[PDB]
Amino acid sequence: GPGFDFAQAIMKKNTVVARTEKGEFTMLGVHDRVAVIPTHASVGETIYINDVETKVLDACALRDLTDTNLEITIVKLDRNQKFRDIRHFLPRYEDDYNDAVLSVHTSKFPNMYIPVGQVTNYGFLNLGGTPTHRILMYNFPTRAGQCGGVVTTTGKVIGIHVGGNGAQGFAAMLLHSYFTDTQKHHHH
Amino acid sequence: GPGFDFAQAIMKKNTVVARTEKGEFTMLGVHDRVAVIPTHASVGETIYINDVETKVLDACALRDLTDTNLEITIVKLDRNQKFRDIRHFLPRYEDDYNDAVLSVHTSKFPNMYIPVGQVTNYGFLNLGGTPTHRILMYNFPTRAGQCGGVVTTTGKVIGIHVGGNGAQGFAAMLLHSYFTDTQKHHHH
Numbered sequence: 001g002p003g004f005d006f007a008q009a010i011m012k013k014n015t016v017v018a019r020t021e022k023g024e025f026t027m028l029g030v031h032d033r034v035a036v037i038p039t040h041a042s043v044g045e046t047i048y049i050n051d052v053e054t055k056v057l058d059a060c061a062l063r064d065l066t067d068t069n070l071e072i073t074i075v076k077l078d079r080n081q082k083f084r085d086i087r088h089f090l091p092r093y094e095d096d097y098n099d100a101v102l103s104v105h106t107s108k109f110p111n112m113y114i115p116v117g118q119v120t121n122y123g124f125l126n127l128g129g130t131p132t133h134r135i136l137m138y139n140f141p142t143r144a145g146q147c148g149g150v151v152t153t154t155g156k157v158i159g160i161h162v163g164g165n166g167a168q169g170f171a172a173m174l175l176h177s178y179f180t181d182t183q184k185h186h187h188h
Numbered sequence: 189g190p191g192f193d194f195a196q197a198i199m200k201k202n203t204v205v206a207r208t209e210k211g212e213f214t215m216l217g218v219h220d221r222v223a224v225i226p227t228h229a230s231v232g233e234t235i236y237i238n239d240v241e242t243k244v245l246d247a248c249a250l251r252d253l254t255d256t257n258l259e260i261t262i263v264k265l266d267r268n269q270k271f272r273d274i275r276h277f278l279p280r281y282e283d284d285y286n287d288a289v290l291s292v293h294t295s296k297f298p299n300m301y302i303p304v305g306q307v308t309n310y311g312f313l314n315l316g317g318t319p320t321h322r323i324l325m326y327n328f329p330t331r332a333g334q335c336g337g338v339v340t341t342t343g344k345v346i347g348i349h350v351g352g353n354g355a356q357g358f359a360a361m362l363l364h365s366y367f368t369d370t371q372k373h374h375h376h
C-alpha cells in the first residue's frame with residue numbers, strides 16, 4: 001500500500017503550521033532552521049510558526065533558469081529547535097512515482113493523510129496567471145487548506161502541494177540539490 | 189503505529205458517500221445491503237448513495253433500554269451490489285482502544301485518514317439538546333464534514349464519528365450484536 005508510516009514520521013518530526021497574511025499552510029522543515037512553503041503564501045519578514053511569531057531571516061523564491069516560478073520558497077527561521085535533517089530523503093532527479101501520500105498539518109487539520117495514487121512529472125502549469133515549472137500531478141480532488149501539504153512515497157519526500165483544479169492535485173517538486181551547503185552570491 | 193492498512197481496506201470495500209437533506213456523510217456498509225449512518229443525518233425513504241438516488245427499505249434509529257438515543261441508524265438499501273460482510277470485525281463489548289484511525293469518504297474528501305490516538309469509553313454526551321449514550325471519545329479537534337467517519341484500530345471497527353467540541357471527537361459505538369440475524373418484531 002502507500003507508505004503511511006513514512007508519511008507520519010515526516011509529519012511528526014518535520015512539519016509545522018505556518019501562517020502568513022495569506023492564511024495557514026503546512027510547512028515542511030528540511031534541515032537545521034531551514035523550511036519550505038509555497039511561494040504564494042507571500043512570506044514577509046516575520047511568520048507565525050505554530051502560532052508563535054517568528055523572524056524570517058531569509059526567504060528565497062526559487063525560479064528556474066528560464067526565469068519561471070517554481071512555487072517553492074526556502075525560508076530560514078529564527079527558532080530555537082533544529083529540524084531533523086531530512087535531505088537524504090529528497091529525490092536527486094525529476095521522476096514519476098507510485099502510490100504517494102499527501103499529508104497536512106494545519107490548525108483545521110493538525111494531522112491528516114490522503115493517498116493520491118500515482119504521481120506524474122507534469123511540467124508546466126498555469127497557477128492562475130503565474131506560469132510555473134517542474135510540477136507533479138496526481139489524480140485527486142485536492143482542496144484549499146491542503147497547500148504546503150507534503151507528498152511522500154516510502155523513503156522519499158518529493159514535493160509540497162501547491163494547487164488543484166477540482167479533479168487533479170499539483171505539487172512543487174523538491175530536489176536534493178535545492179539544499180546543499182553552497183555559494184557566495186548576493187541574492188536580494 | 190495506527191492500523192492504516194486496516195482502515196484503508198474498510199474504506200475501499202465498505203464505504204459510500206450518503207447524502208440526505210442534511211448533507212453528505214461517510215456511510216459504512218456492514219453486511220449484505222445493510223449500512224449505518226448517524227441518526228442526525230435524518231434519513232427519509234430515499235437517500236443518495238454515491239450520487240445515485242436509492243430507496244431506503246428500512247431505517248432503525250437505535251435507542252437503548254433507557255429510551256436514550258444511541259445516534260446510530262441502521263439502514264437497509266435497495267442496491268444491486270452486496271457489502272463485504274464485516275460483522276466479524278465488530279467488537280463484542282464496550283471497550284477502550286489505543287491508536288485509532290478516523291477515516292472519511294465524502295465528495296469533499298473521498299479518502300482521508302486521521303490518527304486520533306487513544307479512544308475512551310465516554311458514556312453520556314449531550315449532542316446539542318439530545319441526550320446520547322454509549323459514546324467513544326478521542327482527543328482530536330474533529331470537524332463538520334467528518335460525521336459518519338469510520339473509527340478503526342487493527343482488525344476492529346468500533347464506531348462512526350458523530351460529534352466534537354473543537355477539542356475532542358465523539359463516535360457512536362458499534363457492537364456486534366447490533367447486526368445478528370434476529371427477531372419477529374413490529375418496529376415502526
Ligand SMILES: *[C@@H](CC(=O)OCC)[C@H](C[C@@H]1CCNC1=O)NC(=O)[C@H](Cc1ccccc1)NC(=O)OC(C)(C)C
Pocket residue numbers: 022023038039040041126127128141142143144145146147162163164165166169170
Ligand atoms: C492552496 C492555496 C490556498 O489554500 O489559498 C490561499 C490564498 C490551493 C490548493 C488548490 C485550491 C483548490 N484546490 C487545490 O488543490 N492552491 C491554489 O489555490 C493555487 C494558488 C496558490 C497556491 C499556493 C498559495 C497561494 C495561492 N492556485 C491554483 O491552484 O489555481 C489553479 C486552480 C489554476 C490550479
Ligand SMILES: *[C@@H](CC(=O)OCC)[C@H](C[C@@H]1CCNC1=O)NC(=O)[C@H](Cc1ccccc1)NC(=O)OC(C)(C)C
Pocket residue numbers: 210211226227228229314315316329330331332333334335350351352353354357358
Ligand atoms: C457532524 C455532523 C455534521 O456534519 O452536521 C450536519 C447537519 C458533526 C461533527 C462535529 C461538528 C463540529 N465538530 C465535530 O466533530 N456533528 C455534530 O455537529 C453534532 C450533531 C449532528 C451529528 C450527526 C449528524 C447531524 C448533526 N453535534 C455536536 O457535535 O454537538 C456538540 C458540539 C455539543 C458535541
